[PDB]
mmCIF file of C-alpha atoms in Angstrom:
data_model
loop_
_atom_site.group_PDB
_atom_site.id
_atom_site.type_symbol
_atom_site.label_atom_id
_atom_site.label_comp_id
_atom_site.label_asym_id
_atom_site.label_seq_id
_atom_site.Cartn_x
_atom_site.Cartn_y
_atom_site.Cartn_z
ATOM 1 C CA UNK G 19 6.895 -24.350 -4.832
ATOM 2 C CA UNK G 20 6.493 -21.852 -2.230
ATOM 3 C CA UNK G 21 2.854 -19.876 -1.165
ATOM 4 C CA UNK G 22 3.404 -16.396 -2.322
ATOM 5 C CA UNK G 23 1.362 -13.843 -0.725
ATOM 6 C CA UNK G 24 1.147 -9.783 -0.968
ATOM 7 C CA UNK G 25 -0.015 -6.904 0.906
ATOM 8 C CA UNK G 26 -0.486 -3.777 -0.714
ATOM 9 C CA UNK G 27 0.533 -0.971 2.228
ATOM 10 C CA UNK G 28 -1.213 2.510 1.281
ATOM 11 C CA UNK G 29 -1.912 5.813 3.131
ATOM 12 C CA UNK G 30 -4.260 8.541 2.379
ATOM 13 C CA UNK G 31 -7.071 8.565 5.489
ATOM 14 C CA UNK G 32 -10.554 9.039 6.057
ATOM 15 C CA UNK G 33 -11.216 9.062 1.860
ATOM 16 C CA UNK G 34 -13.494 6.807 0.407
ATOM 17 C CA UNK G 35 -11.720 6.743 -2.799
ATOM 18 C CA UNK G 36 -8.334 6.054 -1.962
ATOM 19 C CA UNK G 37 -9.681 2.848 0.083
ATOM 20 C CA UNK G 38 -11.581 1.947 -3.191
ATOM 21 C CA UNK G 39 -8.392 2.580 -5.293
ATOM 22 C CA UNK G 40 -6.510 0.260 -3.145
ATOM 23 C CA UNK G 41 -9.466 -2.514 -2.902
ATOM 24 C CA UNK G 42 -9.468 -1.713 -7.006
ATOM 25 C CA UNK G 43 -5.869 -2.950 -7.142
ATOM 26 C CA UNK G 44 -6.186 -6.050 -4.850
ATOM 27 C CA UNK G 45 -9.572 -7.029 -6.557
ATOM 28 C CA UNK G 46 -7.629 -6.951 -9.646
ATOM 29 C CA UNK G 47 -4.584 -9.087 -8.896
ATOM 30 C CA UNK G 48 -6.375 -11.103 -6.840
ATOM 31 C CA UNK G 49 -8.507 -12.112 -10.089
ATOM 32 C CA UNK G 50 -5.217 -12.172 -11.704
ATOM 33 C CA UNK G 51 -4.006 -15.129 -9.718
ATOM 34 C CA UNK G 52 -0.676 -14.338 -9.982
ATOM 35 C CA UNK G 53 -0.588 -14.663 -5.977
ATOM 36 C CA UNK G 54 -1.981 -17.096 -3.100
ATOM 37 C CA UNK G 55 -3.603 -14.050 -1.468
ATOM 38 C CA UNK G 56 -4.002 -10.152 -1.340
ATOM 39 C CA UNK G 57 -4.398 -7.857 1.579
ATOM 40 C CA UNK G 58 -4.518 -4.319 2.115
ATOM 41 C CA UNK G 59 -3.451 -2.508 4.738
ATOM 42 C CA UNK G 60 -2.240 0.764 6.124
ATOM 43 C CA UNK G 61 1.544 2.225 7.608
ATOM 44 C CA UNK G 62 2.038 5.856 9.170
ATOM 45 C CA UNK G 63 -1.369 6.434 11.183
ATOM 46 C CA UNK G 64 -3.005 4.224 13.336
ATOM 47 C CA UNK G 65 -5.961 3.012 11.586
ATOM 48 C CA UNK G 66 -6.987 -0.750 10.651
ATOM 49 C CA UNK G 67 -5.700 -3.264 8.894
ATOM 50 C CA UNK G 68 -2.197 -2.345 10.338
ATOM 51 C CA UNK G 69 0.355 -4.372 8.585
ATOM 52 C CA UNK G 70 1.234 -6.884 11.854
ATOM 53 C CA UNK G 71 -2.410 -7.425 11.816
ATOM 54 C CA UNK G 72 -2.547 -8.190 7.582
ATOM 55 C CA UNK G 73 0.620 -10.353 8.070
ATOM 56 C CA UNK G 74 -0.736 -12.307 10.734
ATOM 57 C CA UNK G 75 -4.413 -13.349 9.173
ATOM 58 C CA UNK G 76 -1.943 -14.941 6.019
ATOM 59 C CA UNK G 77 -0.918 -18.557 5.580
ATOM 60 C CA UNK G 78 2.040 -18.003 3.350
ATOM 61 C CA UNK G 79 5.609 -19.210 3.486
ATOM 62 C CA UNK G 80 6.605 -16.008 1.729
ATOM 63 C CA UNK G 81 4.922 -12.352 1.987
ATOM 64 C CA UNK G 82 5.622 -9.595 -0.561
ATOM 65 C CA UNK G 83 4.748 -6.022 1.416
ATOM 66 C CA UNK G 84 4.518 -3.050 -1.725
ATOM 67 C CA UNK G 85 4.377 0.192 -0.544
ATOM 68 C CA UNK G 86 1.890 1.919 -2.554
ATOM 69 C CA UNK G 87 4.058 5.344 -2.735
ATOM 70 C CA UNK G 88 5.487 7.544 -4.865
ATOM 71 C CA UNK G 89 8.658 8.596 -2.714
ATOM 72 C CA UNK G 90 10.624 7.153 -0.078
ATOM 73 C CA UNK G 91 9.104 9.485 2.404
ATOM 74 C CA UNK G 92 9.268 8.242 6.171
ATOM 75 C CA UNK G 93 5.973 6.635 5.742
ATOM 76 C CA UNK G 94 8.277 4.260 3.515
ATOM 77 C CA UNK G 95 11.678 4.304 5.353
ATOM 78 C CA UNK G 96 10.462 4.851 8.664
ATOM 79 C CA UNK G 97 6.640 4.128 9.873
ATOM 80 C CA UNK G 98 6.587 0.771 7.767
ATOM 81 C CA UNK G 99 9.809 -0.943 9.030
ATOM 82 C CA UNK G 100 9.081 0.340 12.225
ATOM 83 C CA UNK G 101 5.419 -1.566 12.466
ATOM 84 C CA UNK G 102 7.332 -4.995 11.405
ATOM 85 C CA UNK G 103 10.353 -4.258 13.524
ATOM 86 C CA UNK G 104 12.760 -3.835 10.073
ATOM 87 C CA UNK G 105 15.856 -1.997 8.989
ATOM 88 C CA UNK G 106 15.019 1.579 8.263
ATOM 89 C CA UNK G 107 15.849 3.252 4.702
ATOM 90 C CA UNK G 108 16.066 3.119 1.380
ATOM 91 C CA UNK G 109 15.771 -0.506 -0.863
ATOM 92 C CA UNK G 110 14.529 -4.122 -0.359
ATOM 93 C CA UNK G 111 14.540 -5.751 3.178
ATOM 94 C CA UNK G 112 13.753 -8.990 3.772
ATOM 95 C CA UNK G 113 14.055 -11.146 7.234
ATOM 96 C CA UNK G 114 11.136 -12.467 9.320
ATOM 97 C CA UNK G 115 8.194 -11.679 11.456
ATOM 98 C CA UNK G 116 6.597 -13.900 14.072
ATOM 99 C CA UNK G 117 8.500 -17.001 12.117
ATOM 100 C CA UNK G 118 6.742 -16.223 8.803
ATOM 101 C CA UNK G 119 9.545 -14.871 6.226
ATOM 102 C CA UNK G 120 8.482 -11.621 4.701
ATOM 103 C CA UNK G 121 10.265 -8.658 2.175
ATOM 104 C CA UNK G 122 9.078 -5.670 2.177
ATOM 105 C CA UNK G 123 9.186 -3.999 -1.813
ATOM 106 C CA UNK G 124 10.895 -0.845 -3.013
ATOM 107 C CA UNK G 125 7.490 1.420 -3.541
ATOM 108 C CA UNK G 126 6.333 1.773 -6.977
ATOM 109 C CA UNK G 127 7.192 5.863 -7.811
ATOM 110 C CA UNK G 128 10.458 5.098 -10.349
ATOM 111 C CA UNK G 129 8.886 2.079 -12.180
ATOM 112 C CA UNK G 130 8.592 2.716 -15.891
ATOM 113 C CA UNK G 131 5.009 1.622 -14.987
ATOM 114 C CA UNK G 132 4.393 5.116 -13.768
ATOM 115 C CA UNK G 133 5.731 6.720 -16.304
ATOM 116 C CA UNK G 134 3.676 5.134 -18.619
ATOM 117 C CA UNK G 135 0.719 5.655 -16.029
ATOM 118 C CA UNK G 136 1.242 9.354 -16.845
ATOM 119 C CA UNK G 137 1.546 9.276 -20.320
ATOM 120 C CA UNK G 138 -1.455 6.808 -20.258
ATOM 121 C CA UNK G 139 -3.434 9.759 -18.270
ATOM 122 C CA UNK G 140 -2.919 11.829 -21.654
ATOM 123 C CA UNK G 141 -3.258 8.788 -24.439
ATOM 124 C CA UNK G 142 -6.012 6.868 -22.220
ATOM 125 C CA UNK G 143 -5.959 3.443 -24.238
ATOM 126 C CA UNK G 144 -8.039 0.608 -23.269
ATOM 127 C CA UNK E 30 -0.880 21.653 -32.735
ATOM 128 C CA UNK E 31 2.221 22.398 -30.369
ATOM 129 C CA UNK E 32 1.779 20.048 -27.232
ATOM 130 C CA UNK E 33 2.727 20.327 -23.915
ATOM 131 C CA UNK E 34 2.365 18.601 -20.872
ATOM 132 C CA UNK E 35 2.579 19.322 -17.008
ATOM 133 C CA UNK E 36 2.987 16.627 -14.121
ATOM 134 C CA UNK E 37 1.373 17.796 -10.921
ATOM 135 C CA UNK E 38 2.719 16.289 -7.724
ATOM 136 C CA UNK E 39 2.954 17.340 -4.216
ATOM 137 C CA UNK E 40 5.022 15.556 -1.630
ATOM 138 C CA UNK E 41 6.312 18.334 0.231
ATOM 139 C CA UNK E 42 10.438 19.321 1.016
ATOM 140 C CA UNK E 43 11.809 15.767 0.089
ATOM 141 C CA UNK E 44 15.040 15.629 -1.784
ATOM 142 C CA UNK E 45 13.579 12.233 -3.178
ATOM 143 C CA UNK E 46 10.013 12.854 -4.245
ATOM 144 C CA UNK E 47 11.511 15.769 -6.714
ATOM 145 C CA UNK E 48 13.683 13.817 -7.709
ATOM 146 C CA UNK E 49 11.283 10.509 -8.929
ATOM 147 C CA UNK E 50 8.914 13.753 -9.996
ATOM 148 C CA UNK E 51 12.217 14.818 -12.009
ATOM 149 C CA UNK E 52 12.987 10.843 -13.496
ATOM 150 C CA UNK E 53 9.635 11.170 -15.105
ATOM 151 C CA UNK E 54 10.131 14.222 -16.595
ATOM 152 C CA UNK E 55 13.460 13.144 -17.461
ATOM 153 C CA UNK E 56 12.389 10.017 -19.245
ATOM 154 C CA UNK E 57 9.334 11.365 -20.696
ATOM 155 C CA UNK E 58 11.065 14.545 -22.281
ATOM 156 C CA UNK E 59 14.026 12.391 -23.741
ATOM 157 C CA UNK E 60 10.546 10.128 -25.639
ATOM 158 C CA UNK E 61 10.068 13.205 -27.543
ATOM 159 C CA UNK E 62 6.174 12.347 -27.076
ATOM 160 C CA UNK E 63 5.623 16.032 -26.247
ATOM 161 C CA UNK E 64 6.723 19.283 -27.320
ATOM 162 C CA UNK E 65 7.552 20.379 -23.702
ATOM 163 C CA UNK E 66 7.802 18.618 -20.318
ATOM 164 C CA UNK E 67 7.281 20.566 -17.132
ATOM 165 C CA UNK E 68 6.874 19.391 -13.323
ATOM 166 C CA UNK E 69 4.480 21.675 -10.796
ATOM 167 C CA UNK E 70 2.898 21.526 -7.208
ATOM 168 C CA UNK E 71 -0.512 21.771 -6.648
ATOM 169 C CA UNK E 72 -2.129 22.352 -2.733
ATOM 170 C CA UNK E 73 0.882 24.002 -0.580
ATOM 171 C CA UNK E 74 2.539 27.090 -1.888
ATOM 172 C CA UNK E 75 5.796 25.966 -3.242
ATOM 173 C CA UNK E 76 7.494 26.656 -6.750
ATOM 174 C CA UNK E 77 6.737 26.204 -9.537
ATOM 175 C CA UNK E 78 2.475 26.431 -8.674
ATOM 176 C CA UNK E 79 0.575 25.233 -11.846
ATOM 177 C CA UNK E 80 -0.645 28.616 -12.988
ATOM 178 C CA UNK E 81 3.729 29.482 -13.492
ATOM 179 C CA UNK E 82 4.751 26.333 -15.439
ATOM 180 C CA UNK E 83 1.765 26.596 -17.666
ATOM 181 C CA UNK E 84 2.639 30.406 -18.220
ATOM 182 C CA UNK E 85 6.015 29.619 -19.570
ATOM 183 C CA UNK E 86 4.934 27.164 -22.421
ATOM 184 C CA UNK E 87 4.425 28.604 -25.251
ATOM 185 C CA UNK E 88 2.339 25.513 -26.837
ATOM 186 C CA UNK E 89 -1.161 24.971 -28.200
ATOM 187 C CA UNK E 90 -2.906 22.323 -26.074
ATOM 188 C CA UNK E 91 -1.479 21.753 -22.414
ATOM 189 C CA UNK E 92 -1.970 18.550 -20.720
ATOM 190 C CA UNK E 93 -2.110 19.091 -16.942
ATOM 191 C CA UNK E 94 -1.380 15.270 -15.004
ATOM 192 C CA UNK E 95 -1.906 14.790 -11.324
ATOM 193 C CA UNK E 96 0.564 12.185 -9.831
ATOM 194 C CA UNK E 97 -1.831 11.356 -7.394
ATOM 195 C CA UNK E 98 -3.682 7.906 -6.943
ATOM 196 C CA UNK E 99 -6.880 9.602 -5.398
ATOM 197 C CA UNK E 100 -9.096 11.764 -6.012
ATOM 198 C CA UNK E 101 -8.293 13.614 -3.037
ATOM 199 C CA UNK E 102 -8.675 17.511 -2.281
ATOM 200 C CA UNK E 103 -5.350 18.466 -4.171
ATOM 201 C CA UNK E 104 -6.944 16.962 -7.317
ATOM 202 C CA UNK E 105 -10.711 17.951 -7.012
ATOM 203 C CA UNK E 106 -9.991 21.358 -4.915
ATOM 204 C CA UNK E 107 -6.810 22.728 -4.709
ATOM 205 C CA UNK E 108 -5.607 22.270 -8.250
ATOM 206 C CA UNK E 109 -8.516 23.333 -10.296
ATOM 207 C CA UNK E 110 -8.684 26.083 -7.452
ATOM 208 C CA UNK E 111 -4.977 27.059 -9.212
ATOM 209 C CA UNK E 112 -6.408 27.403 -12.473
ATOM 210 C CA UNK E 113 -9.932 28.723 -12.110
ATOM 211 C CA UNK E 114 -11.186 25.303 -13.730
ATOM 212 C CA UNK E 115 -14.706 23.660 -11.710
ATOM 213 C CA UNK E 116 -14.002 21.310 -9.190
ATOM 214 C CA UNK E 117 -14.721 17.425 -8.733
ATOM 215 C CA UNK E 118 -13.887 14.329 -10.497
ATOM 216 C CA UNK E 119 -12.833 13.572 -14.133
ATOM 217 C CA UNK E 120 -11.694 15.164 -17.246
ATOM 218 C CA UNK E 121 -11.824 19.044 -17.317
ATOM 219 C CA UNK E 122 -10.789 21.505 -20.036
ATOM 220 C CA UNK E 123 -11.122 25.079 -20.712
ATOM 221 C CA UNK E 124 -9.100 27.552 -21.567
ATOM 222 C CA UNK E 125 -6.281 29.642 -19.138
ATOM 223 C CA UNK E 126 -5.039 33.279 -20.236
ATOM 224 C CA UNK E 127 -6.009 32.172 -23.744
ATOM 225 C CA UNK E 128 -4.361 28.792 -24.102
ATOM 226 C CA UNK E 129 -6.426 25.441 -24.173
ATOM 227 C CA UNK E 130 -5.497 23.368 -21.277
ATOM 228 C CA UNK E 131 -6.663 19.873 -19.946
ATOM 229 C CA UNK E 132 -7.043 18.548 -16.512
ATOM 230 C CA UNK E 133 -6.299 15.166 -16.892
ATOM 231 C CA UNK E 134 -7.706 12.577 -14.388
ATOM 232 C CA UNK E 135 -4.937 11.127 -11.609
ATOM 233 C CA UNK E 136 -2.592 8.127 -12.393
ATOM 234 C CA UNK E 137 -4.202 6.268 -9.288
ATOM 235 C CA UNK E 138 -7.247 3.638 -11.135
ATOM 236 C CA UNK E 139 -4.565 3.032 -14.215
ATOM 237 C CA UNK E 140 -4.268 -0.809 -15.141
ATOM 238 C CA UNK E 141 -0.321 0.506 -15.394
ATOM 239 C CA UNK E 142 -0.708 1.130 -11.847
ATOM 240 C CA UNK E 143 -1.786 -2.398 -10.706
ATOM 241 C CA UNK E 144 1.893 -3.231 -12.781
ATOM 242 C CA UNK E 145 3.502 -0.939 -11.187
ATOM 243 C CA UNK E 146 2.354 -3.096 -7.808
ATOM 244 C CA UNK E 147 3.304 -6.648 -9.486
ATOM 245 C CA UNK E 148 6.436 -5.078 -10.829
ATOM 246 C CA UNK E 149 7.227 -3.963 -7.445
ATOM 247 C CA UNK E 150 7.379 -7.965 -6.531
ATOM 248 C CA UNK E 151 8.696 -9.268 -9.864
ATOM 249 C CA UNK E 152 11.254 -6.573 -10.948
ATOM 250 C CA UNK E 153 11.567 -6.972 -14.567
ATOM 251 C CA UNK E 154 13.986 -5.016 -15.430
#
């Protein structure tokens, strides 16, 4: 088969937690397995890892990018794309940077995931 | 008891980030895990604030949710700010204009969030 990476592409600045929410979720599926390696890293602002430099530092045939976002605000449709040199919009894109072959993810805001995130916030199992 | 809940986002004027906030609603009213379903926007002024949606349920217990994954200002400041509740991290609940209410905690640490990620990549169904 194939090596399957994934960065997780977040945004919410100078916040300790949000960074810690994001390393939470890499730590996680990194333990998981379920992937040959997991990086963070960062669209809109300029602040470090940018995704070129996340990409680049990965020895995968295939990269998954997931926007960790709720909306497809610009950050999603715009910045990101813009940072790998991809189609703007809405919905999956996939082509190549610097000869590695990467798709960038719809973000996560209409899985049924979230929805059961929210009603988890109330029930809190596990 | 009669419950209610309310799911606090902010994203600003984007046609799409009511409409996911909507989806959920949506979804989660058509469950029938809850007596009412209402959507609200915590730090900017825009419509409906918490303080209004709250107002017009008429239900015991209200369960206030922020769609947020951090514990950022809107959560700790802003929001309990809009509802005269103490600010910080974690569980709050008191009581607004004589009903019960509770401040949950944001989506953002939830295991379904991590599957939310995955999901992104393997897109079952």
């Amino acid at each position: 088969g194939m090596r399957r990476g994934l960065v997780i592409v977040g945004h919410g600045s100078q916040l300790n937690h949000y960074r810690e929410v994001m390393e939470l979720h890499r730590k996680r599926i990194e333990e998981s397995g379920a992937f040959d390696e997991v990086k963070i890293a960062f669209a809109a602002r300029k602040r470090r890892p940018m995704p070129d430099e996340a990409i680049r530092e990965m020895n995968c045939d295939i990269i998954y990018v997931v926007p960790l976002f709720i909306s497809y605000g610009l950050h999603v449709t715009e910045d990101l794309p813009d940072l790998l040199g991809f189609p703007r919009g809405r919905g999956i894109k996939e082509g190549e940077f610097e000869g590695k072959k990467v798709v960038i993810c719809e973000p996560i805001g209409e899985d049924y995931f979230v929805t059961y995130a929210i009603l988890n916030s109330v029930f809190r199992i596990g």
